[PDB]
Design a protein around this ligand. Sequence first.
Ligand SMILES: Nc1ncnc2c1ncn2[C@@H]1O[C@H](COP(=O)(O)OP(=O)(O)O)[C@@H](O)[C@H]1O
Ligand SMILES: Nc1ncnc2c1ncn2[C@@H]1O[C@H](COP(=O)(O)OP(=O)(O)O)[C@@H](O)[C@H]1O
Ligand SMILES: [Cl-]
Ligand SMILES: [Cl-]
Lengths: 277, 285
Amino acid sequence: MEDIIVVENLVKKFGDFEAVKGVSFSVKKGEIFAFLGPNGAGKTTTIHMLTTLLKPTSGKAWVAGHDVLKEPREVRRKIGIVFQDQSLDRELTAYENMYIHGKIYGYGGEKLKKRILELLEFVELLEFKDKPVKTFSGGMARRLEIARSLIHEPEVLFLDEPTIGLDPHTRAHMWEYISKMKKEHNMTIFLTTHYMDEAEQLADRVAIIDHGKIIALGTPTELKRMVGKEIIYVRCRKLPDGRLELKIEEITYHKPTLNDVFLHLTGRELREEGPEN
Amino acid sequence: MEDIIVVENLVKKFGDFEAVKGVSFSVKKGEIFAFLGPNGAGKTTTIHMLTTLLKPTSGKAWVAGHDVLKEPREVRRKIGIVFQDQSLDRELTAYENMYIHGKIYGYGGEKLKKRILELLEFVELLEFKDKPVKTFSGGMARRLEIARSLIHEPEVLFLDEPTIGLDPHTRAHMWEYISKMKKEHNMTIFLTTHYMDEAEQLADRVAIIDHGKIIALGTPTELKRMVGKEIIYVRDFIESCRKLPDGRLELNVEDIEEITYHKPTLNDVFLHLTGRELREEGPEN
Ligand SMILES: Nc1ncnc2c1ncn2[C@@H]1O[C@H](COP(=O)(O)OP(=O)(O)O)[C@@H](O)[C@H]1O
Ligand SMILES: Nc1ncnc2c1ncn2[C@@H]1O[C@H](COP(=O)(O)OP(=O)(O)O)[C@@H](O)[C@H]1O
Ligand SMILES: [Cl-]
Ligand SMILES: [Cl-]
C-alpha cells in the first residue's frame, strides 16, 4: 500500500540532448516494477538518478521516504545497487569483497561472517567463497553483486538490466532470487530491461519507455489488453518494415507478448535483431 | 590466400569447468570471420585468448604471423581490440583519449593529429573531438573505441559483440565501418556475436559455437543449406519433421496455438543443430 518510490516529471538533459523527458510513476512496497524499453530509451539514465549516482536536470524523486536530491546519503543507506559498472575488486576473493562492503556499512564480528555466508548460499556462491573474483564469470560476478548489495539490508533493490549477457541457467536462477526477495522478504525491486519475457514473468507493473518517455504503464495483462487476444504478422495496422499487424513471404501467429505491445505502440520491436534494422 | 589467424585445439578451463573445449579454425587475410553462439558458449573467453588478454589452458594460436602464447607483445602491436570493458578516460575529451593511445604506441607530431581527425571522421565523431567522454552515450563511446583501436594500423580487428546494447541507427553505422574496413582497407575482422542477422550480413565465414565447441563452420549460405528452403514452426507437404523440447514441431515444407513461416536464418540453423534458439527472449526459457 505504501509508496516506496515516487517520481514526478524527472528530467535529464546532456547539453541540449533530452535523455529523460519528464517521467512519473510510483512503486508500492514489495512490488517488482520494471522499466521495459529498447537500447537508447533512457533506462540507465533514469536508474542512475533514482540511486543518487546522477543529478537530475529537474523533477522530483523520493526513495524509501527520503528525497533523492536533498538526502542522497540517507537514500544510499536504504537501497541496493547492482549496475553494469562493477565495483568488485578482482584481487580480493568473493568473501573478502563482501567483508569490505560489510565493514564500510558498519557491520562486523561473527554476525557479519554469518550473513556473508548466508547471502553467498542464497546466490549459490558459498563453494567459491575463498576464490579470487579475477577468476569469476560474468554470471558469477553479477550473482556476487546481488549478495553484496543485500549485506546492509536495503528496502529497495535497483537492477540495471540484471540478466543481459547471461546464459539461460544463470538467467533462470537470477529470476528466482528476485522472486524470492519479493515474496519471502517483502523486498521492492526496480529493474530496467529490454526483455519482454523478463518483464512479463517478474514485474507486477511495467512502464514501457521509448525515447525518454513513459509511453504505457500498467500490469503486463493491462498492457496486453491494448492488443488483440491473437495477433498475425503477414508480409489492421501497416508497419514501416512492410508487414501488416492484424501463398505469401512470411506469416506469424501467436498469443500477444509485451514485444507485440511495443510493436503496436511504436511500429518497431524491443530487440536489436528484429526486422526494424 | 594467407591465413592471418590459425587456432589449433584452443582450450580454456576455469578450475574444473571447461569454458572452451579445444576449438580450431583459420581466418584468411581480409576476411570477416564471426563466432556465432548464445550467451555462455565461450565466445568472450576465446576472443580474450586470441588477443593475449587471457592465457590458454592449452592449444595453439597464431595471429598475424606470430605465436600468441610466446610472442604476445608482437601480436598486441599488430591487432586492434574493441571489447566491453572500455579503457577510455571519462575526464579526457575524444581527441585527448586518442592522443594518449597514439603516443603510447609510438606515434606523434602533425601525422598523429591528422590520423586522429581522419579516424574520428571515419566513425562520425569529428564534430565531438573537443567534448568530454563523460558526456558520451554508449554508441558514441563504442564508435570512439573503433577509431582508437585503428590508430596503430592493426592488421586484425577483434570485436567482442560490437553492436550489443546499441540502437538500430548506430548498429547500422557500426556494420558500415566493419564492411568498409574489410573492403577498403584489407582489414581482417574477427567478431563474436549472438545476432543471426549480423553474422549473415557481415561474415564471409561463421563458426557456430555452443557450450565451448564449434558445432558448424562455413559460409552463411553453406550453413543455411543444412535446413530447408522454407521452414514452419507449429505448436505430403512435410519433407522433414523434428520435435523440439519446448513442444513445437520444426517442419521443412514445399509451397493450433502458434504457427510461424519464413525463409531460413542462422537462428533456424542453430535451432536445427541444437533444439534451441540464439536469443534470450526465445521460448527455451
Ligand atoms: N552520458 C551521456 N551523454 C550523452 N548522451 C547520453 C548519455 N548517456 C546516454 N545518452 C543518450 O541518452 C539516451 C538514453 O540513454 P540510456 O539511458 O543509456 O538508455 P538505455 O539504458 O535504455 O539504453 C540515448 O539516446 C543515448 O544516446
Ligand atoms: N573467469 C571465469 N571463471 C569461471 N567461469 C567462467 C569464467 N569466464 C567465463 N566462465 C564461464 O565460461 C562459459 C563461457 O563464457 P563466455 O566466454 O563468457 O561465453 P559468451 O561470451 O559466449 O557468452 C560460461 O558458462 C561462463 O560462466
Ligand atoms: Cl541482447
Ligand atoms: Cl551442444
